[PDB]
Amino acid sequence: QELGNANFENFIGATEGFSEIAYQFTSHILTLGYAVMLAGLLYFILTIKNVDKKFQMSNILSAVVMVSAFLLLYAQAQNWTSSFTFNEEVGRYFLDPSGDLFNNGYRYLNWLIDVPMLLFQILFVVSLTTSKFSSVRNQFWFSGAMMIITGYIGQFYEVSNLTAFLVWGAISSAFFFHILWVMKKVINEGKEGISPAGQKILSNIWILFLISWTLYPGAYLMPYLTGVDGFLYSEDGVMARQLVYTIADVSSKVIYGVLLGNLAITLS
Amino acid sequence: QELGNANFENFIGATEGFSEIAYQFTSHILTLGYAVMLAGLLYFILTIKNVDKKFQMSNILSAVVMVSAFLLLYAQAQNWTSSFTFNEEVGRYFLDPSGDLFNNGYRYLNWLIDVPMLLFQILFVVSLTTSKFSSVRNQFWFSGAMMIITGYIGQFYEVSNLTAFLVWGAISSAFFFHILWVMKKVINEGKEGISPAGQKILSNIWILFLISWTLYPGAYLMPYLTGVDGFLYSEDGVMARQLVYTIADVSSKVIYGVLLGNLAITLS
Amino acid sequence: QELGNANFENFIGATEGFSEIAYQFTSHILTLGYAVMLAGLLYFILTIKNVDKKFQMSNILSAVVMVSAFLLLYAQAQNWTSSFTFNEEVGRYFLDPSGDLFNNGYRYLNWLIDVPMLLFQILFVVSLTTSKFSSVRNQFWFSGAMMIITGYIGQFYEVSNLTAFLVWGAISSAFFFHILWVMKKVINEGKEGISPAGQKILSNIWILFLISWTLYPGAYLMPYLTGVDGFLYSEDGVMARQLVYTIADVSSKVIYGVLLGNLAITLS
Amino acid sequence: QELGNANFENFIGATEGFSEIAYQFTSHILTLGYAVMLAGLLYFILTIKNVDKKFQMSNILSAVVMVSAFLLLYAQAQNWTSSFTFNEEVGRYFLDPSGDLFNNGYRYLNWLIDVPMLLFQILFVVSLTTSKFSSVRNQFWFSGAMMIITGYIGQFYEVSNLTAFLVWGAISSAFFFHILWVMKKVINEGKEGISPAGQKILSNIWILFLISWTLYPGAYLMPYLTGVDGFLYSEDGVMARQLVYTIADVSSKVIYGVLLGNLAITLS
Amino acid sequence: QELGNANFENFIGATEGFSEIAYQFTSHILTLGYAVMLAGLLYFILTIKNVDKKFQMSNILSAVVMVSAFLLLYAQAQNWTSSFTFNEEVGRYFLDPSGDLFNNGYRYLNWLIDVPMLLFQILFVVSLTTSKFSSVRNQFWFSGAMMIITGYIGQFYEVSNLTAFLVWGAISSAFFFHILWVMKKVINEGKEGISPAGQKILSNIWILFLISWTLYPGAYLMPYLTGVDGFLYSEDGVMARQLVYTIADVSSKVIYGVLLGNLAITLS
Ligand SMILES: *C/C=C(C)/C=C/C=C(C)/C=C/C1=C(C)CCCC1(C)C
Ligand SMILES: *C/C=C(C)/C=C/C=C(C)/C=C/C1=C(C)CCCC1(C)C
Ligand SMILES: *C/C=C(C)/C=C/C=C(C)/C=C/C1=C(C)CCCC1(C)C
Ligand SMILES: *C/C=C(C)/C=C/C=C(C)/C=C/C1=C(C)CCCC1(C)C
Ligand SMILES: *C/C=C(C)/C=C/C=C(C)/C=C/C1=C(C)CCCC1(C)C
Ligand SMILES: CCCCCCCC/C=C/CCCCCCCC(=O)O
Ligand SMILES: CCCCCCCC/C=C/CCCCCCCC(=O)O
Ligand SMILES: CCCCCCCC/C=C\CCCCCCCC(=O)O
Ligand SMILES: CCCCCCCCCCCCCCCCCCCC
Ligand code: NA
Ligand code: NA
Ligand code: NA
Ligand code: NA
Ligand code: NA
C-alpha cells in the first residue's frame, strides 16, 4: 500500500490495525470534544449580559471559537469512523481507503480562526499600559498564522520525511515562542492597577495558557516522544494524540473563555 | 468471529441475532431519549427568566447538559441502527461489522460533562452552611471523573474479562459512594433555614438523585444480574439496559433540572 | 421470507410492492408532517409574549411537543425511503432489508412526550373548580403512559398475531376512554365563570380533541377496517394510515396549540 | 424499463440522460432555492420589531413559510442528486433507481402550508371593507387545498396519462381563478382609505402575486409548452421547470413577504 | 472517459489524480471556509445592537450573506470529498463518478444572493449625494446578475471550449467594471461630509472591495494563468483556486461586513 505524505494513524491502521479499545476510545474522545464545544457555545451566549457592555466582545469571541471548534470536531469524528473499518476475521479495525485517509490538518486550518480570536479576546478585557493595541494584535495575528501554516506543512511529513517534519515544526516553534513572549507582556500590563482578585485570575489564565497551548506541539510530536519504535509509535500514541487534543481544546477554548468572563465580572 | 473487548450486544447480535421487537425497541428508546433532551433544551432556555438572576445559572447548566445528552443520544441511535442488519432468510437482525461494533462507552465519556454539571448546579440553588463551595465542588468533580473513567475501562471487559469488569466497577463504585455522601451533606445543609415547601422539594431531589444515579451501575451489570446464562444475558437484557439508560437520563437530567427550577422559584 | 412481528407495510412491500404513487405519497405526507412541526415550533416561540405570563407555559409546552414531533417525523421519513427500493424490471418499490423493516413504533414511544404535555398544557389555561390539579395531572399521565405502552406492544402483532393485536388495543382503549372522561370534566370546569367567547373556544377544543385523538386508534386498525383481504389491506391502507397520522398530528398538536393560545388571549 | 406514473425527468434521465450542464444546473438552482429560504428566515425574524405589534403576525407567517420552503427544497436538492448518476463511458447522468425516481410532488404537499399562510398574511396587513375576514380566509383555504390536491394528482400522469394530467390540471385551474378573484377583492378593499404610497405597494403586490403564482401552472405544463416532441420535452425543459420553480418560490415567498413588510411600515 | 463540459479539477482527477496534500488541502480549505461563515453569522447577529437602528439593516444583510455562504461552502466541501476517491495501489485520489463531477457553478448561483446583498448593504450606511438610491441599487443588481450569469456559463467551458470560456468571461468582466465604477461613485459620495475617521474606513473598504472582488475572476482563470501546460494546469492550480476562493470569501463577506459595522459605529 502506497500512502504517501499521510499521518501516522494511517500507517498504524494499514499495518497492525486498531483494537476495539483504540478505535472506540478515539471515536469517543472526538465526540466528547464536539459536545463540549456546542455546550460551550450555549453557555457563552447565555452569559453575555453577565458583564458590562465593554467586556461583552469577549463572550462573543468565545462563542465564535465554539462554532469553529464544534464544526471541526464534528467533521473529524465522522472522518475517523469513515477511515477505519472492522475486520471480523481478525477482530481489529483497518484502514478503509474508501473513507479517505485520516488527517489532523483539518484542525490546523481551523486554528486560523481559533488562535487569532483567542489572543484577541484578552485585549478586550485587560487594559494595556506601555503596549499599543494595534501593535499587539498585529503581532499576535501574524505569528499565529505563521505558526499554523508552517506546522500544517510539517504534519504531512510525520512519516514520509522526518527531517521536513522537524524543520517545519522548529520554525513553527519560533513563532510560538514569540506569541508566548507577547502574551506575557499583555498579562503583566493587564495586572497593573487592578484588584488583587483580578491579578489572581490573570495569573491562572497565564498558567492555563502556557500549558494548554504547549499541548499542541506535544500532539505534533506524539508518535516520536518515546523515540524510534517506542511505546507511542502505535495505537497507544494515536489515542494519546487525540486525547491531548481534546484536553487542550477544552482548556484553551472553554476554560480560558470561562476564566476571562470571571475576570470581566471582577472588573465590571 | 473475533470480537475482542466488545460489549455484550455484539456477541448477542453475532450469535442469536435480535428479533424485530428487540431491534426496533432499542432503536425507539434511543430515539425517545434524544428527543427528550432536545425538548428539554428548549424548555430550560425558555424558562430562564422565571427565576431570580442568582438562580439562572442552574437553568443554564441544565441546558448545557441537554446539549451534551442530545448530541450523544442522537449519535448512539445512529450507531445502533448501523451495527445490526436484517437477514431476510432468518428474520433477525445480525451484527454488521461495516457499521462498527456497538459500544456504550460513548455515554461514559459524555458523562464527563453531565456529572460535573449536574452536581455543580445544586450549589447555585442551595446555600451551604458548614461546607465550603470550592471544597464541595472539587470533591464532586474529582470523584465524578474518577468514577467515570474507572467505569469506562471496565465496560470494555464485560464479556472478555469478567474479573476486570468487576474490579474496575468496584473501584468506580467507591467514588460513587463518596459522591452520594457529599450530596447528602449538601441537601441537609441546603434544607437549613428554608421554607417547608423548599425542604420538601430538596427531599424529593434527594430521592430522585439516589434512584436515578443508581440505575447507571445497574445498567453496567445488567447482563449478569440474572446470573450466568440467565434471562438477562440475551436480547431482553440488551433492551433492559437501553431502557434503564433512557429512564435514568430523563430522571437524572430533565426531571432533576425541573425540580431544581421549582426550588429556585420557591426561594426567589 | 421471514418477517416476524413486523408491521403490515413490510408484508405489502415484500409481496406486491408499492406503485410510484403509493411510495411517493407516503414519502410526501411524512415530509409535510415534519415541515409542519418545525414551522409550528417557530410560530409558538415567536408568539409567547402575546399572552399573560401565567399562560406562557402553554406556548412553551406547545413548542416542546413540536420538537419531539419534528425529530420523530424527520426520522420516520428517512426510515420510509430507506426501507423500500425501486425495482426497474417491475416498476414498483419493494422492501429493501438493508434499510431495516419499517415500524410505526417510533411514533408510539415519542407519544410518551406528546400525550402528557398536550394534556398538561390545558391545565395551565383553564381553571379547575371541583377537581385538584395534581389529581388530574396524575390521572392524565398514568393513563396516557398505560395507553401508549399497551398500544405499542399490540402494533408489533398487527400481522403475526391478530388476537394479540386486538387484545392489547382493547386494553389501550380503556385507558383512552378514561382520558376522554377526564378531559371532559376539565373542559366543563374550565367553561365555568369565563366569557361566552372563551366557552366557544373550549367547545371547539373539545371537538378537535375528540376527533383528532380518535384518529390514532383508527390508524392502529387501518389495515382491517375493510375486513379480511379488504380494500385497506393493501398499498391504499398504507397510504391511508400515514395520511391519518399526519392529519391527527397537525390537528392534535398544532391546531390544538393555536386554539389554546386563542383562549389564553381571551383570558389575558 | 417500467417507470409507471412517474414525472418526465425520469423518462429523460432513463433514455437520453442529462448532460453535465443540465444535471449541474438543476442541482445548483435547487441549492440556490433552499439557501434563499434559510436566508429569508433570518431576515424575517430579525425585522419583526420594525413594524407595529398589529402587523408582526405577517413577519411570523413569512418565517413559517420560509421554514417549510427551506426543508422542502433542501430535501428535493438531495433527491435530485440521488436519482441521477454519472456514466463515465457516455459522459451523461442517467436515472439511478437505487436513489428512487425524482418527483415534484414533494413541493405540492408542502404548498398546503405555503399557500394558506401566504394568502392569510395579507389579511393581517390590509383592512377589509365589505368583505368579512372569516369568509375570505375560508375561501382562500378551501380553494387553495382543492387547487393543490387536484394538481398533485394530475402531476403523476404527466407522461403516463396525458388526458388525466390535463383534466386534473383544468380542475386545479378553476380553484386558482377563484383565488385570484378573491385576492383582487382583498387588494381593492385594502387600497381604500390608505395613503398613496401604500396603494402603490399594494399595486405592486398584486402584480407580483399574479405573475409569481401563474408560474406554477406554467411549470406544471412545461414539458408540453413547445408541443409534441418539442424543444421543452427534453433536458432543457427539465432545467426550465426547476428554474421557473425557483424564481416563483423567491418571488411568491420572499419578495412578497418583503413587500408586505414595507406596506406594514407605511401603515405603522 | 468522456467528461464533457466539466471543470478542470475533473480532468486532473481523472488523469493524474491528486496527491494526499492536494486532496486534503482542498478539503481543509473548504472546511475553514464554511466554519468562518457560520462563525461570522453568530458575530453579526450578536452585534446588531452595537449600532443605531438605522444601520442595523447592514448587520442583517451581513448575516443573510453568511447563511448563503455557509450552506454553499458546506455543500461544496461534501461535494469535493464525494467526487475523488483514494486508490491504495497508486496512493492518489482519483475521480469517482458515483459522487458526480465536481463543479464550481454551485458558488456562482449562490452569488445571486451575495453580490446584490453586499452591494446593497453599503447604501444603508453611507449617504449618497448626487446619486439616487433606487438608481444605484438597480445598477448594482442588474450588473451583478448579468456578471454572474455570463460567468456561470463560461465556467462550464474551461476545458471543453476555451474560446467560449474566454468570451463569456470577457462579457462578465464588462459588467464587473461597471460595478466597480458605481461603487467608486458611492464611496466618494459617502466620504462627503463625514468625519476623517469614517473617510479612513471607507478608504479601506474600497481597497478591500477592489482586491477581494478581483480575486474571483482570478480564480476563474487560475488554470491558464501560467499559460499552456503551465504550473497551474495541475493539482497546484486546483489548490490555488479553492484557496483564492476562501480568501476572497472571508475578505469580501466577513471583513467587509466588519468594516461596515465599524463605519456605522463611527456615524452612530
Ligand atoms: C484551540 C486552538 C489552539 C489554541 C491552537 C494552538 C496551536 C498551537 C499553539 C500550535 C503550535 C505548533 C507548534 C508550536 C509546533 C508544531 C506545529 C504546531 C502548529 C502544532
Ligand atoms: C446523565 C448522566 C449521569 C447522571 C451519569 C451517571 C453515572 C454514574 C452514576 C455511573 C456510575 C458507575 C458506577 C457507580 C459503577 C459502574 C460504572 C459506572 C460508571 C456506570
Ligand atoms: C400527537 C400525539 C397524540 C395526541 C397521540 C395520541 C395517541 C392515542 C390517543 C393513541 C391511542 C391508541 C388507542 C386508544 C388504541 C390503539 C393503540 C393506540 C395507542 C394507538
Ligand atoms: C410558494 C408556493 C406557492 C405560492 C404555490 C402555488 C401554487 C399554485 C398557484 C399551483 C397551481 C396549479 C394550477 C393552477 C394548475 C396545475 C396544478 C397547480 C397545483 C400547479
Ligand atoms: C462573496 C461573493 C462575491 C463577492 C462574488 C463575486 C464575484 C465576482 C466579482 C465574479 C466575477 C467574474 C468575472 C468578472 C469574470 C469571470 C466570471 C466571474 C463571474 C467569476
Ligand atoms: C470533559 C469536559 C468538561 C467541561 C468542564 C468545564 C468546567 C469549567 C469550569 C472552570 C473552572 C473555573 C475556574 C475555577 C477556579 C476556582 C477557584 C476560585 O474561584 O476560588
Ligand atoms: C437569487 C435570489 C436573490 C434574492 C434577492 C431578494 C431581494 C428582495 C428585495 C426586493 C425588494 C424590492 C422592493 C421594491 C422596490 C421598489 C422601488 C421603491 O421602493 O421606490
Ligand atoms: C418519556 C419522557 C417524558 C418526559 C416528561 C417529563 C415531565 C417532567 C415534569 C414534571 C415533573 C414534576 C415532578 C414533581 C411533582 C410534584 C407534585 C407537586 O408539586 O405537588
Ligand atoms: C392533507 C393532504 C391530502 C393529500 C391527499 C392526496 C391523495 C392522493 C391519492 C392518489 C390517488 C391516485 C389514483 C387515482 C387517480 C384517478 C384519476 C387518474 C386516473 C388515471
Ligand atoms: Na468505522
Ligand atoms: Na440496521
Ligand atoms: Na427508497
Ligand atoms: Na448524482
Ligand atoms: Na473522498
Residue numbers in the entry:
A (entry chain E), B (entry chain A), C (entry chain B), D (entry chain C), E (entry chain D): 3 to 270
Would you copy out the relevant sentences from the publication that reported this structure?
The EasyGrid SPA routine starts with enhancing the hydrophilicity of a grid using atmospheric plasma treatment, then dispensing the sample or a pre- coating solution on the grid in a user-designed pattern (typically a line of 100 droplets) using microfluidic nozzles ([Fig fig3]). A rapid sequence of sample spreading with the pressure-wave system followed by jet-vitrification allows freezing unstably thin sample films on grids ([Fig fig3], right panel) before storing them in cryo-boxes at LN_2_ temperature. We implemented SPA grid preparation protocols to study human apoferritin, yeast ribosomes, and bacterial KR2 rhodopsin samples ([Fig fig3]) and determined their structures at 1.9 Å, 2.4 Å, and 2.3 Å, respectively using conventional cryo-EM acquisition and processing schemes ([Fig figs2], [Fig figs3] and [Fig figs4]). The structure of the KR2 rhodopsin complex was not previously described with cryo-EM although a structure obtained at high salt concentrations with X-ray crystallography was already available. Our cryo-EM map at 2.3Å resolution shows key features of KR2 rhodopsin including the interprotomeric sodium binding site and the functional, expanded conformation of the central region of the pentamer with numerous water molecules populating the internal cavities. The cryo-EM map additionally reveals all 4 of the water molecules located in the Schiff base cavity of KR2 while only 3 water molecules were resolved in X-ray crystallography data at a comparable map resolution (2.2Å). Last, we observed a different organization of the hydrophobic tails of lipid molecules in the interprotomeric clefts compared to published crystal structures, suggesting the high flexibility of lipid-protein interactions in KR2 complexes ([Fig figs5]). Moreover, pressure-wave-based spreading did not prevent us from solving macromolecular structures at ∼2Å resolution, suggesting that EasyGrid is compatible with a majority of samples.
To address the challenges of cryo-EM/ET sample preparation, we developed EasyGrid, a fully automated and modular platform for high-throughput sample vitrification using ethane-jetting technology. EasyGrid is designed to provide fine control over sample preparation parameters and to perform automated grid quality control at cryogenic temperature. We demonstrated that it is suited for optimizing SPA grids by obtaining high resolution maps of three different macromolecular complexes (i.e. apoferritin, yeast ribosomes and pentamers of KR2 bacterial rhodopsin).
